Design a protein that fits this description.
Entry title: Crystal structure of MAD MH2 domain
Assembly: trimeric
Structural class of chain A: alpha+beta
Chains A, B, C: Protein mothers against dpp
Keywords: MH2, smad, MAD, Cytoplasm, Developmental protein, Nucleus, Phosphoprotein, Transcription, Transcription regulation, Ubl conjugation
Number of domains of chain A: 1
CATH class of chain A: Mainly Beta
Number of strands of chain A: 11
Strand content of chain A: 25-35%
Radius of gyration of chain A: 18 Å
Oligomer: homotrimer
PDB class: transcription
Chain lengths: 199, 199, 199
């Protein structure tokens, strides 16, 4: 249905770095090398520039290497750690599809794989949370974004508590889900407690 | 003449959020829902991401809803508040076309409408300010951008004094005007007091 | 080989301003006027917006005028100062092709010209630094970006020590070089001292 199944924006700490990548090929790689082809469907982080860069970020960028392979197949998306260092994923849909806390950050060690989005499991939540409120379904908006860190992990068991603390990370928007979510939201009504224009 | 009649970039406070939208359809909507189609010509704010986000911004984003409808017709552009909360517009051309101070921020309450750019009124200023200086016509550059806030207002009568203080707002560039302005500027000469390269 | 020979992003101080321009025409101009055509292959800085802008930046933007002409021919790229004020270039490849320190910032006074990238000279470095390490060739990544300031200079002989200190400047990525560099890096191996995921 959508021209792209995902889009990916990259950051270094809390500052967006480089253009947004959009994916139509079902298999995309985000690596740390230097090819600029927006076509190909390699998202190459290595040729993103940043003068604000520091040593701990430069070092990390040199260990992304092969990076992450993100495979869209039917309704599911899996992420594979091709890099020689681990990646770390925070997916609310995956944290649900299992049984973890919504803020759970999972490790995908090198060579490993993980379903990070379940288009079915999501589809439920959608319907379950329709007759559950409006803001109920607004929050699902949070499920269609997945955050992923290269090398350095964050949260429970690390010093880094926020993804914005990690040197190299990406944000993945799943356009499939967002479109279905959109269909639902456009047929509903604003929250209760209206909103002040001054405060 | 131009491929797009406008482009719109969105911010939350003082940080740009999301990609720039470009408009070729004469009617565009900027709403708070979650459709990613760059085609359609709905600019959907709800699927823009931000970890730096805070509670007062999240709340506002949930009241944008239907948002603003921006209608380009002949030379004029009107803005219509479809949202259940008001939008606030700062248009130098509209502040002139009327008689307000250039920094005047106008409210468009829900259901209301307002001509925010007058392609004629602008056209005058252009000619009047040609034989009025160069920096005279450089400043017109400021007229081709319009800033607009959702829900929270800013300036006179609010605590918020700068648009950068508002949680959710957009910046609209009118490519029609800019092109005509460009035609004029390329035939002129730099300002008087030349410029130091050290200070 | 690449769809674009360069891309250029603009900044004001340390904040990215406006969209990235991509160049396929061998001759591009970056000026300070107001045409939005992404086609043309004029990159027009004057119609980039910024509320965070200050007086010293506004003044500079008004002296860019004709700006810089960047000519890609065969393997070489030359930069010509069309502006009435000088531009300042930091090109690691040019600093090498000559004999300067890598951080050397060169002035191109109005009317002047300068080869800022030598596709041959680069080609050497590439091969020389293959059997010289991996991180050896990773650093070449730094050579394919060129930073350029309008009017105000930076570094040795000025108060401004960092390009991020200059009010108006651009970052140019040479996609030719990056692609060849990419070919090389994808056939190699990560650095020695592996990397901690916690620190």
């Amino acid at each position: 249905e959508p021209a792209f199944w995902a889009s990916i924006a990259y950051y270094e700490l809390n500052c967006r770095v480089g253009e947004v990548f959009h994916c139509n090929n079902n298999s995309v790689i985000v690596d740390g090398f230097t090819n600029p082809s927006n076509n190909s469907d390699r998202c190459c982080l290595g040729q993103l520039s940043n003068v604000n860069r520091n040593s701990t970020i430069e070092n990390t960028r040199r260990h992304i290497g092969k990076g992450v392979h993100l495979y869209y197949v039917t309704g599911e998306v899996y992420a594979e750690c091709l890099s020689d260092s681990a990646i770390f994923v925070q997916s609310r849909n995956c944290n649900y599809q299992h049984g973890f806390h919504p803020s759970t950050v999972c490790k995908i060690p090198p060579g490993c794989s993980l379903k990070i989005f379940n288009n079915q499991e999501f589809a439920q939540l959608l319907s379950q949370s329709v007759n559950n409120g409006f803001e109920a379904v607004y929050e699902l908006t949070k499920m269609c974004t997945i955050r992923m860190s290269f090398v350095k992990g964050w949260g429970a068991e690390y010093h880094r508590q926020d993804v914005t603390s990690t040197p190299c990370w990406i944000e993945i928007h799943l356009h499939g889900p967002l479109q279905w979510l959109d269909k639902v939201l456009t047929q509903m009504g604003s929250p209760h407690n209206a909103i002040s224009s001054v405060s």
